[PDB]
């Protein structure tokens, strides 16, 4: 969970806490993942559905090729 500054990112701008556009620093707390389990599971279901649809299309293509072959 570490990042570095690349060309697209720009350059590291140093600053203090609660100064300018920076935020604040709180002791005794930690950050969890910024994810929502409901959204992740729903996206998982939708991705599986799309994968099944694409596999069906590929199967249709293969069946058409095999039908053409048997002539």
């Amino acid at each position: 969970t570490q990042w570095d500054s690349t060309q697209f990112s720009g350059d590291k701008i140093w600053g203090e806490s609660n100064k300018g556009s920076f935020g604040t620093i709180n002791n005794g707390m930690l950050e969890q993942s910024n994810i929502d389990m409901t959204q992740e599971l729903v996206d998982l279901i939708s991705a599986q559905r799309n994968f099944q649809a694409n596999s069906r299309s590929l199967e249709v293509h293969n069946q058409l090729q095999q039908n053409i072959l048997q002539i």
Binding site: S21, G23, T24, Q32
Partner: protein, 72 residues
């Protein structure tokens, strides 16, 4: 669920403070404590605000009310 966990933590902290106050009912010169809490809200650069709910409850401080006690 983390907001509910924060609420549970705040309630348990208040419970512990009240338990300490009750336990120290006979200690000489003891001063009670009061639990004060505060709301939590994010300050992201691009915050929708109207479409963003709260962030739970955070314990602010445990006070040390110094009002004069009774004398025996």
């Amino acid at each position: 669920s983390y907001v509910s966990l924060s609420g549970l933590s705040a309630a348990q902290l208040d419970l512990n403070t009240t338990s300490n106050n009750i336990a120290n009912a006979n200690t000489y010169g003891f001063k009670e404590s009061r639990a004060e809490f505060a709301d939590v809200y994010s300050n992201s650069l691009f915050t929708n605000a109207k479409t963003t709910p709260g962030g739970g409850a955070q314990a602010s401080q445990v006070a040390q009310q110094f009002h004069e006690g009774s004398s025996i």
